[PDB]
Design an enzyme around this catalytic site. Structure first.
Site, PDB file in Angstrom:
ATOM      1  N   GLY A  25       0.819  -1.227   0.000  1.00  9.36           N
ATOM      2  CA  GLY A  25       0.000   0.000   0.000  1.00  9.36           C
ATOM      3  C   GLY A  25       0.848   1.271   0.000  1.00  9.36           C
ATOM      4  CB  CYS A  26       0.736   4.138   2.337  1.00 11.78           C
ATOM      5  SG  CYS A  26      -1.049   4.260   2.113  1.00 11.78           S
ATOM      6  CB  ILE A  27       5.685   1.849   0.119  1.00 10.84           C
ATOM      7  CG1 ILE A  27       5.090   0.672   0.888  1.00 10.84           C
ATOM      8  CG2 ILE A  27       7.202   1.801   0.152  1.00 10.84           C
ATOM      9  CD1 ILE A  27       5.691  -0.664   0.518  1.00 10.84           C
ATOM     10  N   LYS A  47       7.123   2.310   5.209  1.00  9.01           N
ATOM     11  CA  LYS A  47       5.738   1.784   5.111  1.00  9.01           C
ATOM     12  C   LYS A  47       4.935   2.489   6.211  1.00  9.01           C
ATOM     13  CG  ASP A 153       1.919 -14.992   0.015  1.00  5.55           C
ATOM     14  OD1 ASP A 153       1.891 -15.561  -1.091  1.00  5.55           O
ATOM     15  OD2 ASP A 153       1.088 -14.128   0.351  1.00  5.55           O
TER      16      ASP A 153
END
EC number: 2.7.11.1
Length: 317
Positions: A25-27, A47, A153
């Site tokens: 997301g917001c990086i 982050k 993952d």
């Protein structure tokens, strides 16, 4: 709602100061506080998520307990590695903006992901590249496992290259990471109620499919599916990813009979011996068993000897 003012100085809990740059997301790009504003050559990234975001809290904790720069360098020294593919933790804090609480984390900055490169190379990687990537992943895996954590993952989109050295691959996105063996006590073979993620459907483990907590064998299993995907461009269950029970069923049948998997994935019954030996070895692992990582690296090394190459560290991307 922008998290930061571009050029703002933010101070972490350790009192270290950082300047915030443009998004990467917001990086966002981050560097040490200076006269000079943050640039495209930045060495770090920040982050930032709301304080209530559970995944950033899980990631921060993992970095704090297993990602300290000193902790990694001591490992690289004692295991005699050229590098370790785990990003470094530089700091974290809390930051208020417009009356909401946010959490931030400073970490190393990397280059393009392996997936963009995979796609640019017509969804293939050479046997050399796959063998070399896998030896470094095993290093990363061994490290986080010995530090009580599994990833669950692994995939090309979570494998970033050093922005300055294209022969060094790092594993990221520990947001959904799992502490399998806290204080040395392995979790039972059952569902963890706090966890609701099964991983990425095409690559995830049989344990994950069965709603069982991720374990060490799971990670090595996931790596195995990646190797085949990278070598062949396909996976037998790719066509119907929408049906988890089919995907699970295919993996259970192909785990029971590896020779079947090699025949399905590789042309004409001719397949890399090391990939078969890898999957045979991972298969023998029980849920709570510690992998013999060195035995697995030896198997991938027999493969480099077979193509007339050695572990020189070159990914030849």
């Amino acid at each position: 709602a922008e998290q930061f003012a571009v050029g703002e100085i933010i101070t972490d809990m350790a009192a270290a100061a950082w300047k915030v740059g443009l998004p990467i997301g917001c990086i966002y790009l981050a560097d040490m506080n200076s006269s000079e504003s943050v640039g495209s050559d930045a060495p770090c990234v920040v982050k930032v998520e709301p304080s209530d975001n559970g995944p950033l809290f899980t990631e921060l904790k993992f970095y704090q307990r297993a990602a300290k720069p000193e902790q990694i360098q001591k490992w690289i020294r004692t295991r005699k590695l050229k590098y370790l593919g785990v990003p470094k933790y530089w700091g974290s804090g809390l930051h208020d903006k417009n009356g909401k609480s946010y959490r931030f984390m400073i970490m190393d900055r990397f280059g393009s992901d392996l997936q963009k490169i995979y796609e640019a190379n017509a969804k293939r990687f050479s046997r050399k590249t796959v063998l070399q990537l896998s030896l470094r992943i095993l290093d990363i895996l061994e490290y986080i496992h010995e530090h009580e954590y599994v990833h669950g993952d692994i995939k090309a989109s979570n494998l970033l290259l050093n922005y300055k050295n294209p022969d060094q691959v790092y594993l990221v996105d520990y947001g959904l990471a799992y502490r399998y063996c806290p204080e040395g006590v392995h979790k039972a073979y059952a569902a963890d109620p706090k966890r609701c993620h099964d991983g990425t459907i095409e690559f995830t483990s049989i344990d994950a499919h069965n709603g069982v907590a991720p374990s060490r064998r799971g990670d090595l299993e996931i790596l195995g599916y990646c190797m085949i995907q990278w070598l062949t461009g396909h996976l037998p269950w790719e066509d119907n990813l929408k049906d988890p029970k089919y995907v699970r069923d295919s993996k259970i049948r192909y785990r029971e009979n590896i020779a079947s998997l090699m025949d399905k994935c590789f042309p004409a019954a001719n397949a890399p011996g090391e990939i078969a030996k890898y999957m045979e070895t991972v298969k023998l692992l029980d849920y709570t068993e510690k992998p013999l990582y060195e035995n697995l690296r030896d198997i991938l090394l027999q493969g480099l000897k077979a193509i007339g190459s050695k572990d020189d560290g070159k990914l030849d991307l």
